[PDB]
Amino acid sequence: NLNATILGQAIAFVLFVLFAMKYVWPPLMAAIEKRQKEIADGLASAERAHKD
Amino acid sequence: LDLAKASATDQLKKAKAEAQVIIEQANKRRSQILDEAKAEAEQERTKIVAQA
């Protein structure tokens, strides 16, 4: 008898905001630093390598 | 870096090796001569003291 939609949508938006943001965020960041830190890390250690 | 280093050490090593190899060979020659010479001087003293 009450509007009642936005309540459920909102709570699901809370718990699910947590679960989802949590799930994707760490992987994508580790992908960022994975990439920059990848071409990077290789280049640097390899620079020590070549130079030395 | 890696393959380079390998060849560099390996090389300068080997170069040293043949270098000394020759050096000892030649030294062996100077010995060989000065030996033969020594023999000659021997022959000389021989004849001299003799007809003397």
Task: Using an 8 Å CB-CB cutoff, list chain B residues near A50.
Answer: 1
Does A52 contact B2 at a Cβ distance shorter than 8 Å? Answer: no
Q: Count of alpha carbons within 13 Å of A44, Cβ hemisphere only?
A: 5
Resolution in A: 7.8
**Nearest C-alpha in A relative to B4:** A50
Whether the Cβ atoms of residue B8 and residue A50 lie closer than 8 Å to each other: no
- Cβ-count burial A32-51 (b if 16+ within 10 Å, e if not): eeeeeeeeeeeeeeeeeeee
**CA atoms A13, A18, A23, A29: torsion sign:** positive
How far are the Cα atoms of A4, A37, B17, B19 from residue B10, in angstroms, in the given order? 81, 35, 10, 14
Please state how this structure was obtained.
Answer: cryo-EM
Element (H, E) at B1: none
A48 touches chain B (CB under 8 A): no
Last residue before each break in chain B (C–N > 2.5 Å): none
| Rounded Cα gap, residues B12 and B23, in angstroms | 16
Measured in angstroms, the CA of B22 and the nearest CA of chain A are apart by 33
